Write a protein that binds this ligand. Structure first.
Ligand SMILES: Nc1ncnc2c1ncn2[C@@H]1O[C@H](COP(=O)(O)OP(=O)(O)NP(=O)(O)O)[C@@H](O)[C@H]1O
Ligand SMILES: [Mg+2]
Ligand SMILES: [Mg+2]
Length: 334
């Protein structure tokens, strides 16, 4: 028994049909900006390989964000930078504004546009139905774009989407788990926040593709419209799968594993239990129903599918009726 291989059903050969230089972020030598253009104002936080600061560009007094990076692999730094430069100018993609190295210690930093994003509280109490379609659409543009440019984000979640609500401004950020898609390649399933990990990662199927981001996006949509964050709340990776099977049900779980000849850690077998597929309706209540509509559920239903080959692509999703009034507004004359 070997597992059945898989390929992206869209954008499969984007990197195949581009010069090596496009995807070979190791060959890339780096051209460095000037670290003395930037003053740190305040630490915004520490992640696994970095700390992020709010800063000011001193030559022009603009706020920027500076992500200072570990002695990490030089590979990780170069990957993020290459992906960042390849995608710059793309819609709702965060602009890498500059790259700087401390010339003595040689420790790298990335300098990003600043986004004055609304507190992930306060949005919660004010987003309307129209707001969600709109922002879901803007996310889809970024995700179609990067997918078309051969890149999986691999860390789609609400904290990696910056929204400046007073400006109706959205940016997809943290490109540090992001990677080039090459068909047939096996990837690390250690990616994405737990709550946004697709089933393919939870069953340790390594040949996955852009569809992963559409799962994570689905989880986001669910949490926005049901106002439950996160929507699937497992307490570890094992328990994450179970949270999924509890809603989508075990029958399609096992048909999925069956189809790819996947075979599970036997422990999973005892804790998975047996679960009916639930109706989306079950999660709709008085407090969330103004954000719910049948097109919203039909839309969500087509994101949250066990089978990665079955999920809506980014561009199909932008085609869905759910976005009718959004696209209608965005025939923009300018
Ligand atoms: N462009 C930006 N504008 C404003 N705030 C930002 C920006 N980028 C990051 N932040 C803040 O800093 C946090 C972390 O940014 P991120 O790029 O995800 O760091 P990371 O450590 O690489 N990711 P993770 O590994 O998930 O912790 C965000 O949740 C924001 O509060
Ligand atoms: Mg992040
Ligand atoms: Mg990260």
């Amino acid at each position: 028994s070997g597992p059945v291989p898989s390929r992206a059903r869209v954008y499969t050969d984007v990197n195949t049909h581009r010069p090596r230089e496009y995807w070979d972020y190791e060959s890339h030598v780096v051209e460095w900006g000037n670290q003395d253009d930037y003053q740190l104002v305040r630490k915004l936080g520490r992640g696994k390989y970095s700390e992020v600061f709010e800063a000011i560009n001193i030559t022009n007094n603009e706020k920027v964000v500076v992500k200072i990076l570990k002695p990490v692999k030089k590979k990780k730094i170069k990957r993020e930078i290459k992906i960042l430069e390849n995608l710059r100018g793309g819609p709702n993609i965060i602009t890498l504004a500059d790259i700087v190295k401390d010339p003595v210690s040689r420790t790298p930093a990335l300098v990003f546009e600043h986004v004055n994003n609304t507190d992930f509280k306060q949005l919660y109490q004010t987003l309307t139905d129209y707001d969600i379609r709109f922002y879901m659409y803007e996310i889809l543009k970024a995700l179609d774009y990067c997918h078309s440019m051969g890149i999986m984000h691999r860390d789609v979640k609400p904290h990696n989407v910056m929204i400046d609500h007073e400006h109706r401004k959205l940016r997809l950020i943290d490109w540090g788990l992001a990677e080039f898609y090459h068909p047939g390649q096996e990837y690390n399933v250690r990616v994405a926040s737990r709550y946004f990990k697709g089933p393919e990662l939870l069953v340790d199927y390594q040949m996955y593709d852009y569809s992963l981001d559409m799962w994570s996006l689905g989880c986001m949509l669910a949490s926005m419209i049901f106002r439950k964050e996160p929507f699937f709340h497992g307490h570890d990776n094992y328990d994450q799968l179970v949270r999924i099977a509890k809603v989508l049900g075990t029958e399609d779980l096992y048909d999925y594993i069956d189809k790819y000849n996947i075979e599970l850690d036997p422990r999973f077998n005892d804790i998975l239990g047996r679960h009916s597929r639930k109706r989306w309706e079950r999660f709709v209540h008085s407090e969330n129903q103004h954000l719910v509509s049948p097109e919203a559920l039909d839309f969500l239903d087509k994101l949250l599918r066990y089978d990665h080959q079955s999920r809506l692509t980014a561009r199909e999703a932008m085609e869905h009726p759910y976005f009718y009034t959004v696209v209608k507004d965005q025939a923009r004359m300018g």
